[PDB]
Design a binder for this molecule. Structure first.
Ligand SMILES: NC(=O)c1ccc[n+]([C@@H]2O[C@H](COP(=O)([O-])OP(=O)(O)OC[C@H]3O[C@@H](n4cnc5c(N)ncnc54)[C@H](O)[C@@H]3O)[C@@H](O)[C@H]2O)c1
Ligand SMILES: NC(=O)c1ccc[n+]([C@@H]2O[C@H](COP(=O)([O-])OP(=O)(O)OC[C@H]3O[C@@H](n4cnc5c(N)ncnc54)[C@H](O)[C@@H]3O)[C@@H](O)[C@H]2O)c1
Lengths: 317, 317
């Protein structure tokens, strides 16, 4: 029996009602105006532009004052971010990567004012995710947000009902096997960790080697315990994936193909890469298939902003 | 006439007297004990171990309580850093890269407690270097340190007398042409920038393309203006280098060779890569030749620590 297909939009539909209401309350207190979310586009990519347009329309639709400040020359994007940080009118900032396409982007993600960083690119949010820190302040008022991409995927699994919503917080994924074909510091590694923290065993795939992320094994630090595995062998990946009942993928290659033999029956497949790295025939094998995150990522990024704003008001004094 | 050769040690000799005296004053106030500098070694590299030993002996020699906490499995190095951050006894922390050998190391460099980060790996010090910020606080008490590697190279040039010590601060390199064969976010890019900020025109070389870093061109941000150049062409590099009277190199390849034809007569050559990327015959062409930074980097890293400590006492209330 062929597997169904769930669109990112359908998942995002769920959050609309929640997000909207939060914005309305904001509008009251802030004399009719909603929060100003700025988006920096500094790359010449049709896909990025398309996504940017999506974020634009979706946010405006909800009631956000969205501004898409496009930069010509890469190096000035930084400067733009600086004055934007100081711009009180600006309530949230996001950057459309790849800007430079290397370490620089990772530098830039640390330039955005932490309080306004809606995507959760700032290092602090990453540490907190790895060390299971829920808040920021001592008095537990300011809740620490998580980077939208992995947070979205999680929410996707929650929607798909994989997260057994009958177990205590941080263990809903107990008896589950997951595999993430990506270990990028921006999404892959954090995603795998985030999953493992919820109970599931994770097979983290990388070009060089594979690893097995599991629950924290220390008392000095509540961080996921990594179990290193054999060097990247094609047939090895197969074995790992076959055991995994949940597979996530995010390889940048526009011509990547995840062998459908690897997919286990009933396996839930999710792709976050801006490209189609999944082989079409995957439908009959996977129980559920989500072609691309995108729209879901946007919803999270938005609600994250709402949390940041609430945090600003919460830390106003 | 063949060019001379200056050893990193000889340069570091200069700072000994300064560093020592600062430590003695510290010893008084802190009942005979000097500052505790911890070094995390988590890589299986003969060179790194050798360097670690050097830092160990040099610091102890000066009067620093040096501890070399070696970690077996990479993933636990992080945890070690955390408890070390909280360890009040620890006055400074440094990490021996490559730990993981990828993005992770860049993640880890942001895990070290900013106040104890002696090498200047933390993002804040990088921003300040790029935005010419001298201090941290509003009242201009806490001076912001710069990452030891590029800071060392600068000090090397200051020693070599390239920095015309008769011009006002931040313009001693005015009529000088420099080229940096490295654009790593950790050293290359910051170094080139740091140089340009002092007046000199910089040719930043990368595997993909070359660029021309120059003085700040904006009023909204005091950041060096980058002039992008043609894609990396071998004979192009030649042209750039020929104009450059000062050449710095840091390519990781143990078998790299910088064609001596590129070197201009009287050109000052410096290498910071842990490997010999310079062709031996370079002596007759270059006016001065510094084989490797190492020892100088250590001295800076040390004095940086002294500044951090002074900053801690300075921000005690
Ligand atoms: N949907 C979104 O909102 C969103 C957000 C962030 C990232 N992304 C996607 O993720 C990509 C991130 O890649 P990057 O720029 O960090 O590049 P990179 O190549 O440095 O990292 C890619 C990661 O995937 C791994 N990978 C690459 N080829 C692989 C292969 N053949 N087999 C197994 N693993 C492989 C790499 O080892 C690495 O861990 C982006 O290009 C984008 O397409 C999408
Ligand atoms: N002496 C010290 O204390 C110290 C400190 C930091 C770094 N280092 C050295 O610098 C290296 C940093 O490299 P990385 O790990 O970031 O690796 P990487 O390959 O990601 O970056 C190396 C940088 O040099 C450039 N480069 C590489 N090959 C080149 C070539 N053939 N021609 C021109 N440019 C080239 C790359 O484009 C990049 O900008 C280290 O391996 C180490 O050897 C030494």
């Amino acid at each position: 029996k062929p597997g169904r297909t769930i669109l990112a939009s359908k998942v995002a539909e769920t959050f609309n009602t929640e997000i909207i209401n939060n914005v309305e309350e904001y509008k009251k207190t802030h004399n009719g105006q909603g929060p100003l979310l700025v988006g920096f586009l500094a790359n010449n990519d049709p896909a990025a532009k398309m996504y940017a347009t999506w974020t634009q329309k979706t946010s405006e639709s909800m009631g956000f004052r969205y501004d898409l400040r496009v930069i010509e020359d890469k190096d000035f994007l930084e400067e733009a971010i600086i004055q934007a940080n100081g711009d009180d009118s600006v309530n949230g900032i996001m950057v459309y990567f790849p800007v430079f396409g290397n370490a620089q982007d990772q530098y830039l993600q640390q330039v955005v004012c932490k309080e306004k960083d809606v995507e959760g690119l700032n290092h602090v949010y990453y540490q907190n995710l790895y060390h299971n820190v829920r808040y920021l302040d001592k008095e537990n008022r300011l809740k620490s947000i998580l980077p939208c991409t992995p947070l979205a995927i999680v929410k996707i699994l929650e929607f798909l009902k994989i997260y057994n919503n009958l177990l205590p917080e941080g263990n809903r994924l107990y008896g589950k096997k997951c595999i993430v074909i990506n270990r990028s510091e921006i999404v892959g590694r954090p995603l795998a960790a985030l999953l493992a923290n919820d109970g599931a065993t994770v097979y983290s795939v990388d070009v060089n080697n594979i690893q097995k992320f599991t629950r924290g094994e220390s008392l000095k630090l509540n961080k996921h315990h990594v179990e290193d595995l054999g060097e990247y062998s094609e047939d090895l990946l197969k074995k790992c994936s076959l055991d995994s009942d949940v597979v996530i993928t995010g390889v940048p290659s526009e011509n990547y193909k995840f062998p459908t033999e690897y997919i286990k029956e009933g396996a839930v497949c999710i792709n976050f890469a801006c490209t189609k790295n999944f082989s079409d025939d995957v439908k009959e094998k996977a129980s559920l298939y989500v072609p691309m995150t995108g729209k879901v990522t946007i919803a999270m990024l938005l609600r994250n902003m709402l949390r940041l704003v609430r945090n600003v008001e919460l830390s106003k004094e």
